[PDB]
Amino acid sequence: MGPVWRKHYITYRINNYTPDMNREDVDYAIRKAFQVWSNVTPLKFSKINTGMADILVVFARGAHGDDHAFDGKGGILAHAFGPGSGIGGDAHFDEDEFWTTHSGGTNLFLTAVHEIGHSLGLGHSSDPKAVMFPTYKYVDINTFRLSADDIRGIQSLYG
């Protein structure tokens, strides 16, 4: 068990917004993605608009100031750092993707659920039904649900 947040109230901040989507749909997708994990743990997530948040959400392209460049359209979608100070927790989404609320392009909500998993300390699962499986695939977002493996993983860290 590597790093974990040692506190229940976690803050996030949207550094910048992708032009691919309506602003309120970015807010909603990110908020919903946090709720997925707060529904199975004692963690509480609050959006802040100024100051240092635990989890900074960034849309960036190519080389963006960390040692982990993005690759243009396709390939890598996003990445996140495990719990820690500074860049720890932060979630970066490749702006060269086309982010959406639906099945077109790459679904922001689903990607965010996977990346926040990493921000909370989760690795990857070998279970293709898990949100933490290392392969993106679209599933109807209105019906989405964590797998038993994802729940066991997060509860092993927090509950």
Ligand SMILES: COc1ccc(-c2ccc(S(=O)(=O)c3ccccc3[C@H](CCC(=O)O)C(=O)O)cc2)cc1
């Ligand atoms: C079920 O919903 C899901 C949604 C998204 C994903 C998902 C799958 C792949 C990526 S990915 O970006 O194609 C990817 C691919 C291979 C290894 C690692 C990754 C990234 C990290 C990329 C980096 O180091 O810069 C990751 O796992 O977070 C991102 C997100 C998986 C499942």
Ligand SMILES: [Ca+2]
């Ligand atoms: Ca951080």
Ligand SMILES: [Ca+2]
């Ligand atoms: Ca890419």
Ligand SMILES: [Ca+2]
């Ligand atoms: Ca884009």
Ligand SMILES: [Zn+2]
């Ligand atoms: Zn990055």
Ligand SMILES: [Zn+2]
């Ligand atoms: Zn991953």
